[PDB]
Design an enzyme around this catalytic site. Structure first.
Site, short mmCIF file in Angstrom:
data_model
loop_
_atom_site.label_atom_id
_atom_site.label_comp_id
_atom_site.label_asym_id
_atom_site.label_seq_id
_atom_site.Cartn_x
_atom_site.Cartn_y
_atom_site.Cartn_z
N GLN A 1 0.78 -1.21 0.00
CA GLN A 1 0.00 0.00 0.00
C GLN A 1 0.83 1.29 0.00
O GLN A 1 0.42 2.22 -0.60
CB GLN A 1 -1.00 0.01 1.17
CG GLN A 1 -1.80 1.27 1.27
CD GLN A 1 -2.87 1.25 2.40
OE1 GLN A 1 -3.59 2.23 2.56
NE2 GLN A 1 -2.99 0.14 3.13
N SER A 2 1.86 1.34 0.81
CA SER A 2 2.69 2.57 1.03
C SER A 2 3.24 3.03 -0.33
O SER A 2 2.86 4.05 -0.87
CB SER A 2 3.78 2.25 2.02
OG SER A 2 4.53 1.14 1.69
N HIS B 1 11.52 -4.93 1.21
CA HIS B 1 12.19 -5.10 2.51
C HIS B 1 13.59 -4.55 2.50
O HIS B 1 14.29 -4.46 1.47
CB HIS B 1 12.16 -6.55 3.03
CG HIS B 1 13.09 -7.50 2.32
ND1 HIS B 1 14.45 -7.27 2.25
CD2 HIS B 1 12.87 -8.65 1.64
CE1 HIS B 1 15.03 -8.26 1.59
NE2 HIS B 1 14.10 -9.12 1.23
N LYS C 1 10.93 -5.62 9.41
CA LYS C 1 9.82 -5.55 8.48
C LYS C 1 8.69 -4.87 9.14
O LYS C 1 8.41 -5.02 10.32
CB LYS C 1 9.37 -6.94 8.07
CG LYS C 1 10.09 -7.44 6.85
CD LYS C 1 10.12 -8.95 6.78
CE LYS C 1 10.73 -9.41 5.46
NZ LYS C 1 11.27 -10.80 5.54
N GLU D 1 1.59 -1.86 8.30
CA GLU D 1 0.78 -0.79 8.88
C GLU D 1 0.91 -0.61 10.41
O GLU D 1 1.46 0.38 10.88
CB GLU D 1 -0.69 -1.05 8.55
CG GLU D 1 -1.65 -0.04 9.20
CD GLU D 1 -1.37 1.37 8.76
OE1 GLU D 1 -1.29 2.26 9.63
OE2 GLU D 1 -1.22 1.58 7.54
N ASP E 1 0.86 3.03 6.14
CA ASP E 1 0.85 2.74 4.70
C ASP E 1 0.63 3.92 3.79
O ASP E 1 1.60 4.52 3.30
CB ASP E 1 -0.23 1.71 4.41
CG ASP E 1 0.20 0.38 4.98
OD1 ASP E 1 1.24 0.34 5.68
OD2 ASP E 1 -0.49 -0.64 4.73
N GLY F 1 -6.84 18.81 21.06
CA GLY F 1 -6.29 20.14 20.79
C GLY F 1 -6.77 21.14 21.81
O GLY F 1 -6.87 20.81 23.02
N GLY F 2 -7.10 22.34 21.38
CA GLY F 2 -7.52 23.35 22.36
C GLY F 2 -9.04 23.48 22.50
O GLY F 2 -9.50 24.45 23.11
#
Ligand SMILES: CC(C)(COP(=O)(O)OP(=O)(O)OC[C@H]1O[C@@H](n2cnc3c(N)ncnc32)[C@H](O)[C@@H]1OP(=O)(O)O)[C@@H](O)C(=O)NCCC(=O)NCCS
Ligand SMILES: CC(C)(COP(=O)(O)OP(=O)(O)OC[C@H]1O[C@@H](n2cnc3c(N)ncnc32)[C@H](O)[C@@H]1OP(=O)(O)O)[C@@H](O)C(=O)NCCC(=O)NCCS
Lengths: 417, 417
Positions: B17-18, B98, B137, B140, B169, B248-249
């Site tokens: 996927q990546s 890899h 290795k 995700e 990914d 967050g804020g």
């Protein structure tokens, strides 16, 4: 020696995280990024979640490194004049204010184009222009809900869950960044700028692509073989929450390591990689599982996959997470420890890689930021302090042609009001 | 008429996927993307999570639209010859195999540079080159664990939790994409390619920036005022899991809507925006909370924030999530429904915006994909089918100068082995 964007002039008309994240990266690639902030308060992040009285908050310093700050009220006729001159000389304008905000100042895409037909205008909103939610305000988690992430994250018997990762904010910033760079390349051929829009809902969706894959699978078959509800539980109309499932074609789970009762990060992520089953078997002392037909293939493993994770966890629970990975990776297993933010903040390799970076901020001293995430063989960004509010007003006005007296007169008049 | 990358030639030496996510976007920006796949099996995604016998899986079709496929064994002396010629004529090579894989074929960055000094080499790995995990290795969730996401996502009393979003990914793919486009701009000035690396751990970390913000806050003060553990629970050394907190804020939570007992998506995300407190009060029929000092400021609200969410949920639990947002947004509240993947797959505005896109795939018919997430005023990508395995071998070989007989001879010889 040289940087990708040297000479590029950027107007950073942004607040909070989505917009500022994009522009910080522009500065790191060598652009001159001028943050345009309302006089006296500036970017809301300067004052949110402060850890030291009266100085800019980490929220601000970690999102605005390498930028220049000009204080400018773009609702005043004068502010508008300066703004127009800045747009005349700029390559890129980025804004992420509420729907309608910048249009109502009179800087509509249409007008911006007339001032400077080479300008690339970048705009972030909660939602797309044809969305029924086009005028809705969006913070991080609102987008995570609209974008399918919250529906698909967490456990099957728990509520939808937000992710700590900024799916809605910095992620949206990264996506606009991609468009802006693509527009820069496009302008090399056409001689023209263009407008690039990015919604936070669409950023979230892009990262949830494999869940739209699974929705289609589920529409077609009525079950998802690798999800935990198979084969003993139940599928509904929608992709369900999977816990700590692999999410792809390689089962996995979050396993307890020694200390878990007390340390919420005493865990690893363990992948059962299909093509490494034998090694995995050797790693955990179940050589019999190499040829036992209930275990020898993924299809055979699936219906009792949790009995397998349970056996592996009998091992991992006894050693420290770092040792578990040390051992298990000799067998070429995909795994890692669940690293806490504390561990990350002190990791020497992340320091060495320029991923976690120390910066000296005026008035504050040292802080940590996440650096330029991708690494280039031809340059290295120098991550610098964030600007104090209005620190560069004068300089940026002189660059526009304003004289010293002019500058002094505009500040005085402003002070006098 | 024109696209950002028309004329750019890309070698897609990637799997899963990546890497494929990055290159699909390159094709969508107008590049010619040649996916280089091992003969006979190709990209593992072609065969994972199939919903129809013998045809390419959705995993593959949703990540490889608009690409050409050549079958090529780069471990054979002949495969290496073709490969070298492709690198000679290409602008970009992307790989995500890899650690060590492509080096061991002899296409080391150093060698690639000698073949073509204008080539930008893009490489994705689990971890950075100086990481102790450099040879590990990564899928995700392994990255989600290494990158601080899993540690920070989920509930305080539950395990670390993976996010449905592809933090490891497609997110890593998006980040490399940014580098590749930046290298393209840089080459416009230097005349030279360069190498761009991206680790999945670093992609995850970039999105977890605000958690490194909170780690620093916590190191300094010993508490995080807006987190749920304040003021009645307890902080440890590390940023904790916050449930459905705002991050967050602007406090928020995931609230139950009508149907929740049965429908796991019958919920919204509701934000208590500081500057909209009065409206919020009006929305829920607590006008008294506008001036009551226990409620009038965020600082006053925080210690009993869940009593506030509980009151709001007394309302939301009674209507359908879509109606709750319909009502609440008239008061300018940031909220949205938790949209299921089913809802997303059928949403007309996402169809209209080109975010969810129908594509005709040979042998399969129609499928859905997520389209080009950012929108450009100067062009619109046409999202096309994914290639069948080896569909373009012949064409790509002819483009390299191979004759018809040569091609026929290489296929025959391969078949004969
Ligand atoms: C984040 C968000 C919800 C905050 O909304 P908000 O605080 O209610 O409103 P904003 O900060 O956008 O705007 C407040 C005012 O400041 C004004 N403003 C901004 N810069 C200014 C300047 N330099 N001078 C004068 N006014 C300025 C805006 O026009 C607005 O005025 P208006 O209400 O009269 O139109 C909103 O900006 C938004 O939905 N942005 C788009 C999506 C997004 O990126 N989300 C943030 C994720 S981190
Ligand atoms: C995803 C990953 C873990 C899968 O690992 P894997 O299935 O064990 O191994 P790979 O698919 O990378 O490589 C298998 C073999 O195919 C080979 N190969 C790849 N393309 C080939 C081709 N065209 N012709 C011949 N051999 C080829 C590789 O060299 C490797 O051979 P080797 O073991 O002798 O070196 C690995 O590719 C990886 O960690 N990639 C980097 C990180 C990443 O992007 N992760 C994926 C997230 S979606």
């Amino acid at each position: 020696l040289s940087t990708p964007l040297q000479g590029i002039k950027v107007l950073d008309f942004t607040g909070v995280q989505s917009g500022p994240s994009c522009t910080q990266m522009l500065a790191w690639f060598g652009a001159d990024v001028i943050k345009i902030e309302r006089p006296g308060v500036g970017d809301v992040t300067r004052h949110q979640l402060r850890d030291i009285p009266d100085i800019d908050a980490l929220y601000f310093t970690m999102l605005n490194s390498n930028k220049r700050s000009i204080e400018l009220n773009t609702k005043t006729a004068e502010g508008k004049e300066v703004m127009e001159k800045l747009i005349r000389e700029a390559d890129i304008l980025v804004e992420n204010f509420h729907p309608g905000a910048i249009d109502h100042m009179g800087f509509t895409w249409e007008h911006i184009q007339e001032i400077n037909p080479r300008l690339i205008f970048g705009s972030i909103k909660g939602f797309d222009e044809c969305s029924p939610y086009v005028n809705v305000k969006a913070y991080e988690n609102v987008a995570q809900a609209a974008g399918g992430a919250a529906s698909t994250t967490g456990f099957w018997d728990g509520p939808p869950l937000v992710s700590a990762a900024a799916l809605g904010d910095s992620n949206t910033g990264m996506h606009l960044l991609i468009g802006l760079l693509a527009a820069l390349l496009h302008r090399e051929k056409t001689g023209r700028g263009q407008r690039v829009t990015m919604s936070m809902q669409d950023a979230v969706l892009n990262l949830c692509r494999v869940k739209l894959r699974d929705q289609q699978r589920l529409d077609k078959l009525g079950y998802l073989e690798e999800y935990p509800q198979y084969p003993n539980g139940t599928f509904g109309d929608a992709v369900p929450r999977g816990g700590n499932a692999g999410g792809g074609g390689q089962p996995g789970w979050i396993l307890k390591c020694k200390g878990w009762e007390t340390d919420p990060n005493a865990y690893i992520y363990f992948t059962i990689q299909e093509q490494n089953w034998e090694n995995t078997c050797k790693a955990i002392g179940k050589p019999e599982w190499i040829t036992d037909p209930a275990y020898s293939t993924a299809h055979a493993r699936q219906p009792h996959i949790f009995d397998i994770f349970a056996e592996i966890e009998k091992y991992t629970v006894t050693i420290d997470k770092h040792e578990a990975v040390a051992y298990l990776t000799q067998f070429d297993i995909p795994c890692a420890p669940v690293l806490s933010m504390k561990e990350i903040s002190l990791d020497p390799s992340l320091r060495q890689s320029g991923s976690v970076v120390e910066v000296e901020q005026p008035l504050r001293g040292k802080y940590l930021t996440v650096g330029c995430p991708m690494k280039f063989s031809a340059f290295t960004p120098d991550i610098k302090a964030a600007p104090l509010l209005g620190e560069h007003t004068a300089a940026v006005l002189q660059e526009l042609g304003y004289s010293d007296d002019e500058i002094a007169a505009m500040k005085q008049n402003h002070a006098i009001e």
